[PDB]
Amino acid sequence: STNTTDNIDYFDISDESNYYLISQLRPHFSNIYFFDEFKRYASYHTEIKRYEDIHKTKVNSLLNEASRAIGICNRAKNTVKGLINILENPQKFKTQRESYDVKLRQYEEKKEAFRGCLLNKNRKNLDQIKKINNEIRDLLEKLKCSQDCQTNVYFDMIKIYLVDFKKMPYENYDTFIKQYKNSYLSGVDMIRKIEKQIDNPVTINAIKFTQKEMGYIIDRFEYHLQKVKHSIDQVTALSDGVKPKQVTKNRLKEYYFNIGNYYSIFKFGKDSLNMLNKALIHKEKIVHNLLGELFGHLEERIS
Numbered sequence: 099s100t101n102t103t104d105n106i107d108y109f110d111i112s113d114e115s116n117y118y119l120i121s122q123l124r125p126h127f128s129n130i131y132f133f134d135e136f137k138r139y140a141s142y143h144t145e146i147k148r149y150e151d152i153h154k155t156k157v158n159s160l161l162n163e164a165s166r167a168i169g170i171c172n173r174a175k176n177t178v179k180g181l182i183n184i185l186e187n188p189q190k191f192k193t194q195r196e197s198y199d200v201k202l203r204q205y206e207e208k209k210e211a212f213r214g215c216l217l218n219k220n221r222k223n224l225d226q227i228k229k230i231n232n233e234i235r236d237l238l239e240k241l242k243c244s245q246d247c248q249t250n251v252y253f254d255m256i257k258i259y260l261v262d263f264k265k266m267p268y269e270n271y272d273t274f275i276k277q278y279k280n281s282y283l284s285g286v287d288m289i290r291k292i293e294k295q296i297d298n299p300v301t302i303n304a305i306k307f308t309q310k311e312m313g314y315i316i317d318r319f320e321y322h323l324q325k326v327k328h329s330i331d332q333v334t335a336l337s338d339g340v341k342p343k344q345v346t347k348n349r350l351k352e353y354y355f356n357i358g359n360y361y362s363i364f365k366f367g368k369d370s371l372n373m374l375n376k377a378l379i380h381k382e383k384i385v386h387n388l389l390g391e392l393f394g395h396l397e398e399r400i401s
């Protein structure tokens with residue numbers, strides 16, 4: 099419907115140490131994608147078969163626990179959405195009595211409560227990530243090799259990842275966000291200019307409100323776009339670099355964690371970009387509609 103945010107999946111939050119980024123989209127942590135990748139690596143190594151058990155019982159548990167945790171925050175999610183829907187939509191704002199300043203304050207408070215819930219309910223889950231990571235490191239010690247560990251699985255995965263990465267329309271996301279930022283800045287500059295001449299506080303405030311959310315969503319989009327590009331570029335550099343047939347076991351652990359990290363961040367970023375792209379287009383529609391309404395009331399050309 100008109101000028102209404104229907105989905106607020108774009109909010110995210112990281113822990114205080116900034117090691118972990120929590121997304122509202124499954125699997126919620128990029129690390130779960132890394133655990134899913136290591137399932138693949140593990141299948142090439144007879145010695146580390148126990149990972150099949152760890153994945154089934156610990157990784158899938160953690161994913162469900164994350165989903166459960168996120169689900170607990172649904173009432174807080176709805177509360178923020180209700181406030182957004184009032185603030186972005188003058189007609190809706192006009193059906194209640196509080197001042198715009200008061201509703202803004204409420205929104206700020208509930209938004210932080212909601213984001214805080216996404217983190218607080220996932221704290222034990224974050225601890226489980228570190229434990230599984232360490233379990234994987236310990237497990238790789240079981241590899242028969244010591245000084246001469248084969249790198250074929252590593253390089254096989256890199257070849258598969260290069261093909262997978264080509265499926266991402268990177269250039270399109272880049273072109274989109276550049277055009278979008280240009281339009282966004284123009285809209286902010288427009289409001290700075292016309293608000294001097296136009297007396298329509300609720301509509302101007304609604305536009306500013308939506309523009310502040312757009313700035314946040316753009317920031318989130320650029321964060322993931324950069325992460326995706328880094329993964330593509332770095333894994334490409336590995337495929338173009340030296341190709342040792344054999345390395346130490348500790349080195350092979352680092353190899354697997356390195357490409358598993360790049361691949362999981364890539365997948366997590368792909369998920370988020372798709373969602374954020376939709377989010378941005380829909381916010382921009384609201385700004386278009388409200389700017390159109392602002393100008394529609396003018397009886398003469400504004401200079």
Ligand SMILES: [K+]
Pocket residue numbers: 162163166
């Ligand atoms: K559960």
Ligand SMILES: [K+]
Pocket residue numbers: none
């Ligand atoms: K008023």
Ligand SMILES: [K+]
Pocket residue numbers: 152156229230233
């Ligand atoms: K474990």
Ligand SMILES: [K+]
Pocket residue numbers: 253254256257336337
């Ligand atoms: K390669």
